[PDB]
Amino acid sequence: FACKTANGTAIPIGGGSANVYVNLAPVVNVGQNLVVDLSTQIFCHNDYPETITDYVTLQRGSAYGGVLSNFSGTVKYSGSSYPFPTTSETPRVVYNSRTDKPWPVALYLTPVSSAGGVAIKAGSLIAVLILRQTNNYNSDDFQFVWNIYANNDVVVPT
Numbered sequence: 001f002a003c004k005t006a007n008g009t010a011i012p013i014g015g016g017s018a019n020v021y022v023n024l025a026p027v028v029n030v031g032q033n034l035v036v037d038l039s040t041q042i043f044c045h046n047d048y049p050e051t052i053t054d055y056v057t058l059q060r061g062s063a064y065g066g067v068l069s070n071f072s073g074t075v076k077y078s079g080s081s082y083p084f085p086t087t088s089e090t091p092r093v094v095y096n097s098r099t100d101k102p103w104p105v106a107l108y109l110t111p112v113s114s115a116g117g118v119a120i121k122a123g124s125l126i127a128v129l130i131l132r133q134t135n136n137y138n139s140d141d142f143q144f145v146w147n148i149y150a151n152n153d154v155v156v157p158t
């Protein structure tokens with residue numbers, strides 16, 4: 001089991017860490033979500049599906065900088081919404097193919113009343129997401145840690 005970003009940044013067997021750089025809608029108003037769709041950014045596969053099935057959760061996710069300050073968040077895992085920053089581990093997604101498939105995570109961030117002006121700075125950390133991989137074969141239990149960065153400012157009009 002290993003993962004990679006869309007631009008090819010890999011985390012190998014055993015887990016590790018990588019940075020992910022995302023484009024964000026530049027203007028977001030109150031009552032709208034800023035969507036950060038990581039299912040187009042992070043992909044994983046099973047290296048031995050003949051014999052092993054892998055299980056993958058979002059073990060935890062945290063918000064940083066302008067994201068935590070200026071927005072109310074949820075994370076959708078396989079299309080289902082949970083609190084973000086997280087307070088528990090998600091259900092487990094089955095990875096049973098050597099063909100890469102997305103990690104099905106997306107953040108939905110809606111402005112709170114104190115948002116106004118530059119709500120997310122270009123270059124800033126928006127989230128750290130911990131992908132946990134186990135399997136049905138042995139005790140392997142590995143963490144793939146993704147630091148998510150904004151490619152551009154996001155402004156909330158006032």
Ligand SMILES: C/C(=C\[C@H]1O[C@H](CO)[C@@H](O)[C@H](O)[C@@H]1O)c1ccc(-c2ccccc2)cc1
Pocket residue numbers: 001002013014045046047048049052053054134135137140141
């Ligand atoms: C590829 C592999 C393990 C990796 O790939 C597995 C499948 O994705 C993961 O579940 C593991 O955590 C690890 O990332 C592997 C496991 C067992 C054997 C094996 C084969 C014959 C006899 C004993 C063990 C070979 C490869």
